[PDB]
Amino acid sequence: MFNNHEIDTILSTLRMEADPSLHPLFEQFEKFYEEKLWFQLSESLTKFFDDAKSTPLRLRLYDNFVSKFYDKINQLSVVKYLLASLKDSKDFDESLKYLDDLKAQFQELDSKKQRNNGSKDHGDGILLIDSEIARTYLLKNDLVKARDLLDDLEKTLDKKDSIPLRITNSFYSTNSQYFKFKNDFNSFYYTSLLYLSTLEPSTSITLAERQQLAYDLSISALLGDKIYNFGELLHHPIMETIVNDSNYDWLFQLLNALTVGDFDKFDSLIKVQISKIPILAQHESFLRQKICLMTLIETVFVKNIRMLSFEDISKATHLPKDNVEHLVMRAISLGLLKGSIDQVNELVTISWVQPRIISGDQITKMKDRLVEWNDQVEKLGKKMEAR
Amino acid sequence: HEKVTIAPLVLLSALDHYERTQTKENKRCVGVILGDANSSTIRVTNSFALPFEEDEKNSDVWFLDHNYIENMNEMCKKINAKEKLIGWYHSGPKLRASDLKINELFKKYTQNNPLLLIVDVKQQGVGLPTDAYVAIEQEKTFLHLPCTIEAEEAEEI
Amino acid sequence: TKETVYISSIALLKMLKHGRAGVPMEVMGLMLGEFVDDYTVNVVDVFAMPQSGTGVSVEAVDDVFQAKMMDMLKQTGRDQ
Amino acid sequence: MVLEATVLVIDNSEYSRNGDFPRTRFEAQIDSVEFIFQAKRNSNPENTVGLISGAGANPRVLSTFTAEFGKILAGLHDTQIEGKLHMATALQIAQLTLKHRQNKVQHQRIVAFVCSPISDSRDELIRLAKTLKKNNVAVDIINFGEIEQNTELLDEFIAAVNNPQEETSHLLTVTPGPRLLYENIASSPIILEEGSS
Amino acid sequence: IRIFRSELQRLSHENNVMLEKIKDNKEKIKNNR
C-alpha cells in the first residue's frame, strides 16, 4: 500500500490536463524511498488527508509548482499544509531559513496575486505570515521577544472573521508555548482550553500527540486552582481518551484526593519531579476546603444554616487549626473568594467562589429551595389574593 | 453588553404584516429593522416586512429576496436620511437553519451587528412579544439583551 | 354623499411621525387603502414622499417614486 | 416564438477544483451570460434571466430577474470555486424563484451548471421531478465534470422526470479544454428552439 | 482580444450603477436647493 508513490502519482496525472507540469525530478524522487513509507509532503490532494513527519527531499521542488497547486485542487494546501507543515518535519537545519519561503515568498504572493482574499474561499493570505510571526521566537532565543508579537496576533483575532477555526487556534498555540516554560500556568491552562476543548475539524493530531497534549493539560492545573479543578478535564473527552497508567492518571487521582484529603497517598504514586514543588501542595488545599466552602448554601442541613468549623476542614485539607486563619486570608488576597471571617467565633461566610458543574444531590436540593418560593404562593400569596 | 429600545409603532406594524400576507403556522415572516446602531442603545425607528417563504418540514427550504432590499433602501433615502439598516427581524418562536443562514445575508447591507428579534404573533405569556437577541460566536450563540419600550413625546401621547 | 374617514392605530402614528420634523418645515406622504364611497373609508398603510423645491404642492408628487413604492408595497399585500 | 423564464444555477463540487483548463475557468460562465440574455430578452419580450447559487459558498440568490445582463454579472462576484454541493437546495431555490416573479402563467426553465455526477439521494431527485412537472419547469443539466460523466443519479433524474415532450429537460455535454462554452449552449435546445409548450 | 473584454464589461456596468445612482441624486439636489 503506497499512498504517495502510487495513489498520489496516479491522481496527479488525472487532474490538471495531463500532469501538473511535472518535472523529471518528480517521478525520480518518488522512487527514492520506495517501501520505506516516507510520504514527504504529499503535495496537495493526498496531503490533505495524509500527514508526513519525515524530512522532505522535494522541499525545493514543489516551490515552482505553487502556481500549479492553485489551479489543481485548492489554495488551502499552501496555508494549511506544505510549507506551513514544515514544523512537523522537525528539521533543525532549516531553523530560521524559512523567512525566504514562509514569509518573504508569501509576501511577494500577497503583493501580486491575492490582495486581500484573492479568489475561491477565505483563509489564504492571512494565516500565511501571521502563523510564523510568533513561531519565530518559540524555539532558539527566549520567549521574551515573542511576547511583543503575541498582542499583534490577538488584535487580528477579533478583527478577522474566518469560517474555519484552525486560524483562531493557531493564535492560541503560540500563547500556550509562551506560558509553557514560564510561570503562571493559569494563563497556560486558560489558553489551552480555548485552543482545544471539543473541536472535530480543527486541531487534527495523532493518538500519540493527544497524550502529549494531555500531559501539558495535566501540569497546567497543578500550580493553580482557576477554572474549576482537576475534575473539569474529566468531563471533557481528555482523561477518558487517554490511558490510565504511565503517569497519565495525575488528573484522575487528584479528583478523589480532594474528598480523602491525604497528600501521602498521591505522593506515593508520583515521582520526585512534581512532588518537590510546594505550590502543588499549597494550591491543592484550597480545592479541598472549596468543597466544604460550597456546603455553606445547601448540602446536609436542610434549614440553610451557614456555619463552618475549623476542625472539619482540618482533616479534609491536612492542615492544623492555627493555620486555618492564614489559609483563608491568602484566598481573598488572590481574589479566590469574597467575604468576611471571624476569628473570635471561628465562623466564615463567603459570597461565592466558582460554583461547579456538579449534579445529582446538588440539583436535587436546588429544586427544594425553589419550592419554598412556591410555598409562599400557597401561603402568603393566596392571602393577598383574598384581600 | 448593549441595550435595545423598540418603539411601539414598529411592533404594531409588524404584527399586521403577518395578517396581510395570510401566513399560517407552516410559514414565518421575516423583515428588516431600521435605526441607529452607532450608540450603545440600539433603537428601531422603522421596519418593513419581506416576502419570506419557508417549509416547516424541511429546514433547508427558505426564500429570501435581496432585490426588494436594495430598492427599499434607496426609497428610504428620499424619506429619512438618518435611517439605515441596523439588522433584521423575524417571526415564530423557533430558530432553525432558515433563520441562522440568512443572518449573514443582511450583514452585507448592515455595517454593525444585525439585531435578531423573535416576534410572537400570538403574544403568549407575560409581556414583551418581541425579545432582543444579538449574534456572537465563541456555533451560533444568541445572547439576550434588555428590551425597553420607549417612544417620542407625541408618539406616547 | 360624503365620506367618513376611519384611520386605524397603524396609520395615525405613521402619518403623524412623518410630519414631526421641525415647526417651519413641511413634508408630504401618500395614503393607500381599499373601500367604497357611501360613508365607510379605510387606510391600510402610508409612507412619506420626497420634498421638492416647491415643498408641499401638486407638482411635488413624483410619479416615478410613487410607481416604485407600489411595486415594493405589493410584496406584503398592502398595495391598494 | 418561445416565452419562458431562465434561472442560471451555479453549483460546485469536488470535481470543480480545477481552475485552469487552457488559462482559467468559470470566466466562460461569466461571458456566457451576455449570450444567453441577449438571445432571450433582447430577441423576444416576456423572457427574463435570473441567477442563483445552490452550492459552493452559500445557497442563496445572486441576482433576481433584471432588464440587463450586467446586473447578473454583479452576482457572479464573490463566488467560491470550491464548496459544498446540495442538489435539492438548488432545485428548491429555483422553484421558489420561478414561483414569485413577473409575467406569470408562462413556461419555466432552469439552467444549471453541473460539474458533478450529483449523487445524493434517489428519492429526493424523484420527488422534485414529479413536483416540477405540475408547474411546467424545465431543468437543463449541463455536464462539465471530466469529459463526460454519466450512468449515475444525474441520468436517473433525467429519465424519471419526463412525462411530457418539451417541458422537462435537455442534456448538454461540454468537452474540457480550449472549447467554446457559449457555442455549445447556443446550438443546444436550452436557448430557444425546442422546449416551447 | 478576448481578454480585456471580460473586465471591460464589468467596468461598463459599474459606470451605469454610478450613473443611475447620481441620476436620482442630481434630480434630488436640485429639488433640495
CA distance D39 to chain E (A): 18
Amino acid at position B101, single letter: K
Residue with cell 460523466: D149
Range of the domain at B85: 1-157
Please state how this structure was obtained: cryo-EM
The CA radius of gyration of chain B, in Å to the nearest whole number, is 15
Paired sense of beta strands B130-137 and B140-145, if any: antiparallel
Q: Which residue's entry shows cell 441567477?
A: D51
D26: nearest CA in chain A?
A120
Chain E positions in Cβ-Cβ contact with residue C50 (cut-off 8 Å): 28, 31
CA distance D47 to D102: 10
Between CA C33 and CA D165 the distance in angstroms is 46
Q: In this complex, is the C-beta atom of B81 within 8 Å of any C-beta atom belonging to chain C? A: no
Residue A349 placed within a domain:
yes
Smallest CA–CA distance, residue A71 to chain D, in Å, is 4
**Which has the closest alpha carbon to D63: D7, D4, D142, D139?**
D7
Q: 3-class SS at A56?
A: coil
Closest CA to A134 of A197, A179, A94, A78: A179
Residue A264 lies in a domain: yes
Residues 43-72 of B with CB under 8 A from C: 48-51, 65, 68, 71-72
> Sheet of D4-10: strands edge to edge?
D60-63, D49-53, D4-10, D107-114, D137-143, D171-173
Q: Got the DSSP string for A191-234?
A: HHHHHSSS-SSSS---HHHHHHHHHHHHHHHHS---SS-TTHHH
- Backbone Cα Rg of chain D: 15
CB distance A167 to A126 below 8 Å? yes
Determine the Cα–Cα distance for residues D80 and A115; give it in Å rounded to an integer. 16
Question: How many domains are contained in chain B?
Answer: 1
Closest CA to A215 of A175, A246, A255, A187: A246
Answer whether A120 sits within 8 Å of D18, measured CB to CB: no
User: Is residue A1, in this structure, part of any structural domain at all?
Assistant: no
Length of chain D: 197
What's the first-to-final CA gap in chain A, in angstroms?
A: 87
The structure was resolved to a resolution in Å of 7.0
Rg of the Cα atoms in chain A: 28
Q: Which of B72, B88, B63 is nearest to C71 (CA)?
A: B72
Window 8-27 of E: residues touching D by CB (8 A cutoff) are 9-10, 12-13, 16
A176 in a structural domain: yes
The one-letter amino acid code at A19 reads D
Q: Name the nearest CA neighbour of A72 among A22, A26, A16, A122.
A: A16
Distance CA(A182)–CA(A199), nearest Å, equals 27
Give one DSSP letter per residue of A364-378, joined into a string.
HHHHHHHHHHHHHII
On whether the CB atoms of residues B130 and B13 are closer than 8 A, the answer is: no
- The answer to whether the CB atoms of E6 and D73 lie below 8 A apart is no
Contact between chains at E6 and D74 (C-beta distance less than 8 A): no
Is residue B30 within 8 Å of residue B90, measured between CB atoms?
A: yes
Which amino acid, residue B18?
Y
Give yes or no for a contact between A69 and A43, defined as CB atoms under 8 angstroms apart.
Answer: yes
The amino acid at residue A288 is R
**Cα–Cα separations (whole angstroms), residue A262 to A221, A225, A249, A289, A331:** 18, 18, 17, 13, 21
Element (H, E) at D45: none
C-chain residue closest to B13, CA distance: C10
Rounded CA-CA distance E7/E3 in Å is 8
Type of residue found at E16: N
Whether A14 is covered by a domain: the verdict is yes
B65 contacts in chain C (CB < 8 Å):
75
Cα–Cα dist B87/B99, whole Å: 13
Question: In chain B, positions 86-105, which contact chain D (CB-CB < 8 Å)?
Answer: 101, 104-105
Q: Does D86 touch chain B (CB under 8 A)?
A: yes
Distance from CA of C36 to the nearest CA of B (A): 20
- The enclosing domain of B156 has a CATH number of 3.40.140.10
Distances A122 to A109, D73, D82 between C-alpha atoms, Å: 15, 21, 11
* Range(s) of the domain holding residue A290: 6-387
On whether any CB of chain D is under 8 Å from the CB of B53, the answer is: yes
Q: Pull the grid cell for residue A81.
A: 499544509
Q: How many domains does chain A have?
A: 1
CA distance A120 to A74: 8
- Residue A348 falls within a domain, yes or no? yes
Nearest to D18 among A72, A119, A121 (CB): A72
B30 phi and psi angles, rounded to 5 deg = -130, 140
Go through A119-147 and write b for each residue having 16 or more CB atoms within 10 A of its CB, e for each that does not. Answer: bbbbbbbbbbebbbbbbbbbeeeebeebb
